[PDB]
Amino acid sequence: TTALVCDNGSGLVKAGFAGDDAPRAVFPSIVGRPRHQGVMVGMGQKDSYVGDEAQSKRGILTLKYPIEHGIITNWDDMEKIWHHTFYNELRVAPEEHPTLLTEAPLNPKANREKMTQIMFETFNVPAMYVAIQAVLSLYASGRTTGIVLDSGDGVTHNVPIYEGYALPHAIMRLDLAGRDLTDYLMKILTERGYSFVTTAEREIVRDIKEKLCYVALDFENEMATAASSSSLEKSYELPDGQVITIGNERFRCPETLFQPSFIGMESAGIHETTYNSIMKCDIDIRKDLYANNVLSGGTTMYPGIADRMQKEITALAPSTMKIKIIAPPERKYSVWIGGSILASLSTFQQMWISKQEYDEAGPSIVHRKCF
Template identity: 60%
Template sequence: MPINLVEDDIACVVIDNGSGMCKAGFAGDDAPRAVFPAVTGRPRYDIVMAGMGSKDCYIGDEAQSHRGVLSLNYPVEHGVVNNWDDMEKIWHHTFYNELRVAPEDHPVLLTEAPLNPKYNREQMTQIMFETFNVPGFYVSIQAVLSLYGAGKTTGIVFDSGDGVSHIVPIYEAEQEIVRDIKENLCYVAMDFEQELCASAQSSALEKSYELPDGQVITIGNERFRCPEVLFQPSFTVSFNQTLSCLRSSLTSKRVSLFVGDLRRQSSVWLNETILNSGVGIHETT
């Protein structure tokens, strides 16, 4: 039976971390309520800053306005957090100064760049739960949210940000399906070259796999070619071949070109409520 960890009428806080800008708001809104530079600034000269108050760290627009006497630091570099102390200060500023909410009262959806290191996710989770005491937390890739916001579940998202650009192919499939295929059909060949020759001369190695929608796919020498990469790193598919396969797949599915909303800062908010009720803020027992 599913148990809600938070009340249904409490809005989820959405924070879109970027290398240059931080955007924050609430699930269900059409646009973020706060957009400010993701930068921190510390005084270069104590005497100069004496008349500006006793703050030892300035954040966002305030840091930019005093950049002449501050040492600026961007905690997110090329989409990856490299300074957790400053990142925590930006999140604190987001909750208490920009949105003016108590983080312990709202679940949080945080965005990340593709290929974000596992350690970074663990750090995000630890800070959100242990420092801000949020009742629920979920991390999602920015490109995925943008695609959902466009009303699509399959496509290629070109996300060009301040510090990094990504081209992310997304297909309406389940990771569990791929894992099941890997665990049940893939194997390591004792003699790779001999197995490759055998697969070319006979279809005995081919296996069928039924997808959840009833479609049946046939897997041949991919069963042992994929695991072989672990033992022969040079045995990889070239980038051009990958693009060719991806292009033919999208063409066969008649995927149309969709130009996203020019308001880039709002793309994450357009349909993030799909994830607002996801496993990140609900627990099943």
Template identity: 30%
Template sequence: MAPRKSTQDLSSPPRRTLVIDNGGHTIKAGFSSPAFADPPPAPSDDSQTPQTALPLPSIIPNCLARDRDKKVYIGSQLSRCDDFNEMIFRRPVERGYLVNWEAEKEIWEHEFFDQKAALKCDPSETGLILTEAPNALPQLQTNCDQVVFEEFGFASYYRCPAPSLNAYHNIQSLFPVPRAPPKTSSPAEILLLIDSGYSHTTVTPLLQGQAIQPAVRRLDIGGKFLTNYLARLISRRQYDMRNDTYIVNEIKEACCYVSRDFKGDMERTWKGPKGDRREVYATSEGIAIDYVLPDYHKRSKGYARDHDPNAAGKLKNLTTGKSVEAAEDILTLRNERFTVPEILFNPSDIGMRQSGIAQLIWDSLSAVPFGLWPGFLANVVIVGGNANVPGFSERLDMEIRSLAPAECIVRVAKAADPIVSTWQGGAILATDVEALKRLSITKQEYEEHGAAWAARKFDGR
């Protein structure tokens, strides 16, 4: 259990704030305080003064894991594992919501309160900014508030939807004509935030950093869904990898891309009629790629390389029982590379009755006044791990333009670091003592007014 002091100075705010972006796949965590100076003003054309970079958080696997030797790993201990075959994971976050606090507390105890923890802190002297999924269930929010104050005893606490923290960046710097950063940590005036992460994808319109709740839209497809779908395709066509999702996730990150010409890429990867293989199929005009699987003897991590039909042929002979010496296990990916991330844009391809991202954006805009459309369409920002899939932002830009009114300017930008962008927004907020004090509640306030009062304040009521 986290250490707590019996007395503390309640008259002054905590000296530092622990910012936790509690994602389904990883926890992005680190400390921030007013000691982090605001970014300096943009230098003049003849100035060579370097800009101060935002701090980077620790990225911690948000899971408990057990390997085939029954050894258990907690959070960051996963980096010590050297064999991920048949690894079993237990994740506290399901479908984007924190539903298993027993597992989460064990991870937090190890990462933040253990004597040897890299981010060790005394919660009675530390503030907390904690993210949650948009439109989380009230009972889950109440459980979260109780654990933070009654189990850990943090001095102050701000629970907020993860997309809202991205408004504290200098959003205009992401677009082709950047502007100087604001002099204060005030949130961006208007922003349409696309967050495509491990558990799901959300579209959140933000005004002055506050989500317009009726316009929030969600797609139940994220990195986990794509990994599982890729594992099914590989298992059906090559190897059975349904129990090796960790390796399949690495394959996805190394090989997959979003196609800008889906029909053309499908044509290039078509094998041809039975008994009459097309010549282009051998390399698929550069689409085909080989992924060399780790053997955990010579290679602890797999890697992608250009497709070699001869190497693939040797492996095929080996798997059919012929005596051919093969030192590598190779997966050859063709249309899997782009059909898997295509689900984000066309879920109906696999029978899901949900709209793709572009249509979700349009549904979201339909729930806000028409006069705000130009502002949202001119400030579309993408965050989350799926934003790093090559071609994602370009394809989304193309699809939004095809739906937007001709008189509206469409600007789509990917955050400088999509995975840690939310955390960095929280770190910027933590540098503004007055703004954070206005948004947070203290442990004393929680004890005086109760969980229901805390829920109303975090909901803006």
């Protein structure tokens, strides 16, 4: 048989068969419903629209994200998303395919318990497993040591791993992610004169952020340059024409990652959290961690992020140390690649959670050695 690797993530579900080079199906994890009445008779539109389909009918629907920050809030729509992924995008019955899932660090145990219960009862998969995103990301890069920073759309976490031995006491989780950056961009664009309120226009703002934003190596100098020069302004085309222009907001939005105080968060920037996490570890493994800093997640795709991160860490770390940041081109798909590699290992075949083992041990078995 073959194993199935699915990554719910947050804001982007990516699924495929184990052993493949890239995920087969990638689509937003969005469930939408029609807020209007509808007058045509015989159209027979269905109640809910899931996945990329709901994107095409954005103007008529209202969208809801089942995942806020890693955790799942609404379960019925999550079940709908899983069913759509299994039956429509992959067109494979899950009755004979082990499923590997990715789960962020430091989340409620009830999340895993309900996930496994739903997967074992609703779909009756023969077996399934849950793994941490950071470990899979490290698998994909081919490394075995080094601190990995995974910054998705829901949560950003640093997990230091040395010689394949994780250090749980040094794991650091921060709720700042891509969704908060999009919200801050929505809030800041009002200054120029553009107002976005409808959940549909959240997607337009997200597209603007993806295709236009960039990270500045130095902040005050860039502000001074923008205050005088006009070489930074760029124009974007909305779906219905009405071109808009954007200047400072081009690079102010990502700076929230390094300056959480913009959005009122008390915590420090991601660079400072990474340095603190490295220091929280022992003293004999800091060399490799400094020299094997790994980045992953969609939010990390900002151009120029690596240079700023390296500059900040070098400013923090001792000068004698060498700081290197690994930024593969396929950052956002690193987790799924790592999961595919892990599911294809021969030694992993005995670490699945079997059906009858699940039944006799109960839903809590997920928290035993079969982590």
